[PDB]
């Protein structure tokens, strides 16, 4: 037979389109400030991630 589309989705053509994305949405590195107290940040932008 022939390799099916599911097997062909291993990468290459079927990679994610991430040019317009603004960055990974990870929270933060767990540091001493977050482990023993708190840290105050100010939100400055709210953007749409394609």
Partner 1 sequence: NPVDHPHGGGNHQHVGHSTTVPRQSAPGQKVGLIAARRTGLLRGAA
State the DSSP code for 2: -
Identify residues 4-33 at the interface with partner 1 (CB under 8 A): 4-7
Using a 10 angstrom Cβ sphere, with 0-12 exposed, 13-18 middle and 19 or more buried, the burial of residue 47 is exposed
Angle at 28 between CA 22 and CA 32, to 5 degrees: 155
Return the residue of 8, 21, 33, 34 that touches RNA, per CB under 7 A: 8
| Selected binder of RNA within 6, 7, 30, 50 (CB under 7 A) | 7
Q: Which is nearer to partner 1, 6 or 27 (CB)?
A: 6
42 binds partner 1, rule: CB under 8 A: no
């Amino acid at each position: 037979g022939r390799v099916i589309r599911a097997q062909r989705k291993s990468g290459g053509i079927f990679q994610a389109h991430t040019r317009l994305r603004k960055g990974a949405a990870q929270l933060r590195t767990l540091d001493f400030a977050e482990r023993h107290g708190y840290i105050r940040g100010v939100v400055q932008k709210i953007i749409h991630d394609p």
